[PDB]
Design a protein around this ligand. Structure first.
Ligand code: MMC
Ligand code: HG
Length: 162
């Protein structure tokens, strides 16, 4: 048998979170008279945040995170750069939506499996990790293992095949 490890982001839920975050943002006493933009590029899978200083960026980030929590979206699905791009008077950050599993994260998954000694095979393909084993009880252990760890982005488990 097998199962797929996946990392999917429901954009629908994300657009919802960004709307909430713009409503909070428009009532912020400390942002009155201050440029501050929180936009979603649904085609690019990016959330662009722009304001007048790195501090204020941090402040926008807390809003964002504060909106995922309200929408029960896991914040770690956001890939937020450490540095800001400074343009004239403005500073911004392109925040990436973690849609799927890139090789780097897949290798952290595959590595964890090797280390757990569970007798299952891993195939890094597409944007997922397929876990194949003789034993369903082992496959379940794998699920608990990956759930327990903090590799860095949320995972889902589907396509259980016999
Ligand atoms: C974005 Hg929350
Ligand atoms: Hg989010």
């Amino acid at each position: 048998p097998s199962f797929d490890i996946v990392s999917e982001i429901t954009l629908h839920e994300v657009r919802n979170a960004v709307e909430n975050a713009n409503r909070v943002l428009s009532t912020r006493y400390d942002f009155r008279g201050v440029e501050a933009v929180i936009e979603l590029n649904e085609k690019n899978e990016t959330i662009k945040i722009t304001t007048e200083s790195d501090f204020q960026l941090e402040q926008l980030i807390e809003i964002l995170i504060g909106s995922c929590i309200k929408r029960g979206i896991e914040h770690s699905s956001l890939d937020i750069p450490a540095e800001s791009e400074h343009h004239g008077k403005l500073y911004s950050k392109e925040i990436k939506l973690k849609q799927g599993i890139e090789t780097e994260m897949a290798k952290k998954i595959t590595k964890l499996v090797k280390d757990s000694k569970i007798k299952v095979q891993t195939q890094i393909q597409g944007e997922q990790v397929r876990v194949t084993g003789k034993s369903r009880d082992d496959l379940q252990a794998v699920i608990q293992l990956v759930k327990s760890a903090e590799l860095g982005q949320p995972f889902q488990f589907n396509n259980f095949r016999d």
